[PDB]
Amino acid sequence: NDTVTIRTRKFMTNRLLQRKQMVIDVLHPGKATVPKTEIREKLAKMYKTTPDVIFVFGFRTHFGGGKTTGFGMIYDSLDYAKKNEPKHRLARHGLYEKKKTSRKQRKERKNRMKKVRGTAKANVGAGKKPK
Amino acid sequence: PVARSWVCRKTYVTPRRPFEKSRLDQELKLIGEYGLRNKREVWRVKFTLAKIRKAARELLTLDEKDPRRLFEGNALLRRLVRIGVLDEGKMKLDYILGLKIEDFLERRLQTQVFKLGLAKSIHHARVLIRQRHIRVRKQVVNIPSFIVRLDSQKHIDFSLRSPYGGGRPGRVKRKNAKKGQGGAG
Amino acid sequence: ARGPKKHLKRVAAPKHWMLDKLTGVFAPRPSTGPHKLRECLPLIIFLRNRLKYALTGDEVKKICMQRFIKIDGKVRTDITYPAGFMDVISIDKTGENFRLIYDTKGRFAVHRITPEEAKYKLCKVRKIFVGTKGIPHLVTHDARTIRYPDPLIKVNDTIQIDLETGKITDFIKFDTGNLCMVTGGANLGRIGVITNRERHPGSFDVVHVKDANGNSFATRLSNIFVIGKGNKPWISLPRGKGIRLTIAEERDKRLAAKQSSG
Amino acid sequence: GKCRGLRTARKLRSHRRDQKWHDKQYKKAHLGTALKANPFGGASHAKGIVLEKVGVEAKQPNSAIRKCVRVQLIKNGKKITAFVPNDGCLNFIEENDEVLVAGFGRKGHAVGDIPGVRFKVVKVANVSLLALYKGKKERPR
Amino acid sequence: VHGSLARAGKVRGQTPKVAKQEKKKKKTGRAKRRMQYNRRFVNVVPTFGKKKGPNANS
RNA sequence: GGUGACCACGGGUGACGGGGAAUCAGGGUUCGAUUCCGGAGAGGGAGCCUGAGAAACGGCUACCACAUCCAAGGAAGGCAGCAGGCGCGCAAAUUACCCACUCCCGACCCGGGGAGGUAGUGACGAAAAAUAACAAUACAGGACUCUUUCGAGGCCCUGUAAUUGGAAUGAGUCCACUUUAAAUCCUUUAACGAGGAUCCAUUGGAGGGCAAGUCUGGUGCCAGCAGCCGCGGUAAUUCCAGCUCCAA
Ligand SMILES: [Mg+2]
Ligand SMILES: [Mg+2]
Ligand SMILES: [Mg+2]
Ligand SMILES: [Mg+2]
Ligand SMILES: [Mg+2]
């Protein structure tokens, strides 16, 4: 916080997804890489936006510390962020719950769905006994 | 299938015969003078020199004012004067063949940081670079074989985080100071 | 194989796509369309690898489903639609239109065009004939066919199709002294004036064409695309004006630009 | 003299591949008789079972008892003789052990004063013979 | 066969076992190259021994 | 009638073809199962249904060879797909996570994909690069210097052993951050982390080829070494060892 500055380059705004995307780099001389939460509050401060619609990712620290470059995408509204954004970035900010079922379990369950023909009760009940 | 690259090459060539007293003595002269780790390092820079000479030979056998010769000859000359192994007044393809291995080893970062007074010996230069105390421009380099360029020549200096530029002395210093103050009243 | 291929390998992709080996194993296999996949540019790589509007395949699909791109004035929801050559890619939300023209180095360029100049398109007639009821028909390189063409148009000529109507505004005859652009082969992306056409019966004709700098180069007849009358082009040209520079001069051009910027 | 005509390439090429059969290396590498006769079957190494321990007299100028083993290969069941190349490594060998056997070093030709032994023992009972000789690891007792 | 395998490993068994003496750790890597570079190039003395070898037993 | 010494036909192939790989004066010689393109096959043959496209095999039918369950009346097979096994061998990995990326399929902005991505085993191989540096004492060495050998120091580099002797760093422990679909690794960065810095560099050699010992003890044509010359029958520069050197 004492000596940490943010700069933005390759900035361009596209209304196609109603967002403004840019490449951001943070200059932290003596600290570690700055956390994403601090980056979002600084970027929202610079662009006069709320620090809950911002997304930052892809942060790589250069060798020897100092600068760290990532990609920052901001939006003109939160609703558009729901419309077009990767679900993992949404879940990072807590705006999207995640499925908690194993892919292997889903394949076994679906294979048991294929085994049962027609009958809805047994089709949805095939995953009950062999848990 | 997979999106891997599989693009690699060897940077060195082993000598055709082993155990020649003349060759072994000459290579050990280069290792001792420029603080090289092993014989592979002098073989790799000999190999890069040989590749440059091979390209220069092929261009020389090519006809005069050939567009391919002029373009690639000027390109190769530009790289040589950029890394400082070839004099700027000596912009000739013939003069490339006169290059040796001594001036290629001269341009290494280990040699340079010794010859700019930042290191007491060539071995002190290598261990300092490996310990990450020397930076070029704004980026700190820990590679002894970093071939420096003429533009980057003037900008070699101690890194800020090292206990030779900015603050933050090393853990040996902090531990020794702690024991000194803790060992008395 | 047993049927048509619906996959495209990344390295097997056309060179002008500028795709890289590391990102993925595959490539955007272009769907069937008005242009051959070997000479097209799929819309996905247009909005992602050229205009940087989208980042991956999912994002570029999002604009298509929001129905913002109008290839030839028609909304296309196909992510891998083969655009092709001299097509007005119009995004009216940003009010920006592009004509997909080859540059100097034989690759599709980001050629911005004014909205008024974006209402028409040049096309090369590939064959003419007469169908039922004695109706003359004409087909173009853009695969679009029109009924009732002007009888003066012969094959390998040029027509000025009009968007939103699909009619002919003007036509250009193919003869010596016309401004053309090479659309295939080594000289792809070059502009010159037709100087000579050698006819080889039973084989492909060879057309010799001279650019504005005096450099004269040959090509096949099928690679010839007339784009103007005399010396004046009928469309806006991409940067470089369709000239070809040998490796000596674009080197010092880059050095001069670096010197001026420094 | 050799024909140098501009249209003699057929005779030059036919004469080359005809005369190439007259040198040993090309003949053995393409006829296939050497491959069939090789107990290893073109393999660098091959495993076998120690039939018995044997001693072979050296050649005329030398005088020693080279320590070898008769070993039949687990593939194709051929009985061969393998040298045991150290000071006391025959003691490590014993009856009915699985031994890795390599060539001796000059491609099916006998080496040194050992008469008619083309092979040497590399590993015995899955542990390296050099490891046993230098005491890095021991026979599983 | 003659049954002369009894003598196998005779000399290696008979050789008395003397342990390796303890010595300082040898320099390795770049420092080892430095040591042998100094041992034969910077201390060159012209002597009537006809350039004795590095392992001379004199 | 057609094809053949301008090599037909036949046989062999440890032959899928090519783009390419290795070696590299030039010319050539080998290798191309292997990620790209084309072909062929799905235990061996054969015949079919549907479909635009199959002679499909994670479609069917029959025979041949194996082989599964049976209440012996019957039924069900195709891992040269990803894992994982047995066998074969000199010879080759996890019965892992995920559609986030590249794309593909679908009625489709939403579903699916052992395609593919990620991680694990991984000294096939390739790139980079630690295992130490510095200072001052002693004794040599240097064109050293001062009287012209004799002694010292106004100088330079190594060496040997030392409370030296206090500077620097990782390899590791380990916080957070970062990456990522979730992780891991890497890069940052807190706190520890070096004086046998015991935080320990090995593999092969020392007669010649071919760099390096006419050292010491044992053996005594034996054991063994030795790619080739050759060594070994009593003080073996060649074996077995110790020390010391050499090569990477
Ligand atoms: Mg075959
Ligand atoms: Mg192949
Ligand atoms: Mg098939
Ligand atoms: Mg159909
Ligand atoms: Mg079938």
Ligand SMILES: [Mg+2]
């Ligand atoms: Mg170590």
Ligand SMILES: [Mg+2]
């Ligand atoms: Mg010895």
